[PDB]
Amino acid sequence: GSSGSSGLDESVIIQLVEMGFPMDACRKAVYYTGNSGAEAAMNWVMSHMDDPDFANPLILPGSSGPGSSGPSSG
């Protein structure tokens, strides 16, 4: 019939991930957007990606030991 699955939509995530994006981030869009199509999800991504804190994982429980540097020049 139809791939129920329920709870978020991986099919969308997969795609994005296939486009060359971080799953987590992909899971962030859908999540935040609350699963409302790829286009919508993407947008959120297209907006988030704008920042380098896009790939980063979901909010952490009070960042304690972060592991990021970010080189100014390349």
Give a nutshell description of this structure.
43% of the residues lie in helices and 0% in strands. The protein has 3 helices and no strands.
List the helices and strands in order: HHH
Q: CATH superfamily assignment of the domain at 10-51?
A: Ubiquitin-associated (UBA) domain
User: For the terminal residues, how far apart are their CA atoms?
Assistant: 51 Å
For the CA atoms, what is the radius of gyration? 14 Å
Q: How much beta, percentage-wise?
A: under 5%
| CATH architecture label of the domain at 10-51 | Orthogonal Bundle
CATH-derived topology of the domain at 10-51: Helicase, Ruva Protein, domain 3
CATH class of the domain at 10-51: Mainly Alpha
Molecular shape: globular
Provide the structure class. Answer: mainly alpha
The number of helical runs is 3
Main sheet properties: none
Give the proportion of residues in helices: 40-55%
Number of strands: 0
Subcellular location: Cytoplasm; Cytoplasm, Stress granule; Nucleus
Subunit structure: Homodimer. Interacts with TRIML1.
Protein name: Ubiquitin carboxyl-terminal hydrolase 5
Family: Belongs to the peptidase C19 family.
List the main descriptive attributes of the protein structure presented here.
mainly alpha, 74 residues, 0% strand, Helicase, Ruva Protein, domain 3, Ubiquitin carboxyl-terminal hydrolase 5
Description of the structure:
It is a single chain. This protein starts with 9 loop residues before the first helix and ends in a 26-residue tail after the last helix. The chain has helices spanning 10-19, 23-33, 38-48. It is 43% helix and 0% strand. It has 74 residues and is mostly helical. It has a domain at 10-51: Ubiquitin-associated (UBA) domain (Helicase, Ruva Protein, domain 3, Orthogonal Bundle). This is Ubiquitin carboxyl-terminal hydrolase 5. It is found in: Cytoplasm; Cytoplasm, Stress granule; Nucleus.
